[PDB]
Each structure stands twice: as C-alpha cells, then as structure tokens.
Chain A
Amino acid sequence: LLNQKLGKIKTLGDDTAAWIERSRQLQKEKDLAEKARDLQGLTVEHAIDSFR
C-alpha cells in the first residue's frame, strides 16, 4: 500500500551553465521579492459528603 502511495510522486529530489543562468534569474527574483470545561465526565473516587 505504501508503495502504491509512494509511486505517484516524482523522485527528482537540465544542463549546467544555463542552470547557472537560471540561478542568476532566481537571484534577481528573490532580490525583487525582498524589495473547567475539559473536566466534564471525569470521575472522583470520593463521597460527595466527604467535602467540607
């Protein structure tokens, strides 16, 4: 069952230099972005009369 569940998610956890260009664009993008109720039902093991 877990294998069925863990199949529909891609396991990518393309080039090299244009990836660095992608990183430069991401740097530009991030620079631009920078700019008493709970006690109901509880049982007491004592007689009621025992309380003064």
Chain B
Amino acid sequence: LEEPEDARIMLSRAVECCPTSVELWLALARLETYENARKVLNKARENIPTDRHIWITAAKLEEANGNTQMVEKIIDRAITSLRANGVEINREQWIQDAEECDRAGSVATCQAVMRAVIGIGIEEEDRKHTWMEDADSCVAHNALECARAIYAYALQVFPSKKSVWLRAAYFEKNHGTRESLEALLQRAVAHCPKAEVLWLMGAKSKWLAGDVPAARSILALAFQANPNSEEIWLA
C-alpha cells in the first residue's frame, strides 16, 4: 500500500508477533539499507531460524549485498544445515536459486551455490553425468555460470570422457569465447589427450572463427608438437 518505508515498519511490527513468516522476512530483507539488511537477516536468524528457505534468502542477500567470500561462508553454513538441521539439498531449489541470482544479483554466488549443490547433495557414483546434464539444462535457463559449474564438477575431477570438455568449448563458442576455448583445450589436453577433442576442436574453432592468420597460428601450434595423427596435417 503506497509506501515501502511504512510497509517495512509495519512488517517489522507484525513479524515481532509473526515469527514463522518467510514472506515477511524476505520483504524485510529488501529494506534498501545494506547494513540494515544484514541486521534484518540477523534478526530473522534470531526469529524463526533459517531451516529451509531462509538459507536461500540469506544466500541471495549475500549475492546482492556482499562479495563471494561471505557468500561462500553462507553456502558452507547452509551445507552444515543440510546435515545438522536435516534438510537435504534439492535440485529444483538449486536451479531456482541460480536463476534468481543470475537475473537479479551477481552470478558469483549463483556459481558458488551451483558448485555446492553439484558437490554436496547431487553426487551418485564417480561420474556426475546427471550433474553435467542438470548443469547444461540450467545453462539453458541461466547464464554461463551453470556451464562453469559443470566444468568445475567435471574437469577438476579426472575426466573420464573429454566430450564434456568439447561440449563446453562448443558452448563457449556459442558465447563467443575463444580464449576460454583455448583454456578448456589446455585443460583437456593435460587431462585426457586420448582423442581429437582437445587440440583438434580448438584448431577447428579457430579455423571457423574468421581470422585466417590466427587460424594458421593455431594450426601451427597444434601441428608442430602435433598431439594427434596426421589429421592436424590435413587441417
């Protein structure tokens, strides 16, 4: 009703008598005062404690009014709540939080939450292939943060299949990132040079970009050492 300040004051006066009100706590989190926003989050903690959704609200607040260090600290606190409070991490909640932190806030906390949900909560047997598919689907709904989370979940562990790295490089090309394609090629070549997806894919991306001299330089780089068969020579 026509007044955000009066609304905040009324919500503070009501929440003093309404502890279990997630919507009221979230409204108070938007009080348009960073220090007072942190104070309101601390009061909500002193209110009905952060069990399931107030953790997500605090993560979003850290995404907006804060940096990545405090965001990661809050993510670790939520992971502690993921076992002490007795509430496992849900894939839909992680995807919704990533989308909200990409649309409104910074993508750093979205990526941190995606990493915390792909490492803890969603990990079944040595593969994280389902995690890779979920992160690709989130990349179809969010920014490149989901693709970066997929890369963190896959490339950091021993890459059993370089095709995930090739798909990430193709997505980076769809994002117009050639230096990121080179970095992914370097990571995959030093982790799994057992196919034509590390150096050959980068050489093809350079030869399909539009810079003929840069394509020739990339071909020279990939054919001098030649970490493949004579296919690099044909290219």
A residues near B, CB below 8 A?
16-17, 20, 23-24, 27
Contacts and interface: CB of A to CB of B under 8 A. Distances in A.
B231 interface: no
15 contacts: A16-B3, A16-B6, A17-B6, A17-B9, A20-B6, A20-B9, A20-B10, A20-B13, A23-B10, A23-B13, A23-B14, A24-B13, A27-B13, A27-B16, A27-B17
Contacts of A24: 13
Contacts of A20: 6, 9-10, 13
Interface string B1-28: 0010010011001101100000000000
Residue of A17, A20, A24, A27 most packed against chain B (CB within 10 A) = A20
Nearest to A16: B6
A27 B157 CA distance: 57
A24 B10 CA distance: 10
Interface residues of B, number: 8
Contacts of A17: 6, 9
Contacts of B16: 27
Nearest to B16: A27
A29 to B, nearest CB: 12
A23 B14 CA distance: 9
A27 B13 CA distance: 9
B21 to A, nearest CB: 15
> 5 smallest A-B Cβ distances: which pairs?
A16-B6, A20-B9, A23-B13, A20-B13, A20-B10
A7 to B, nearest CB: 30
A17 B10 CA distance: 8
A20 B1 CA distance: 14
A20 B12 CA distance: 10
A29 B167 CA distance: 66
B82 to A, nearest CB: 36
B38 to A, nearest CB: 23
A9 B16 CA distance: 34
Contacts of B6: 16-17, 20
B5 to A, nearest CB: 8
Contacts of A23: 10, 13-14
A27 B3 CA distance: 22
Interface in B5-56: 6, 9-10, 13-14, 16-17
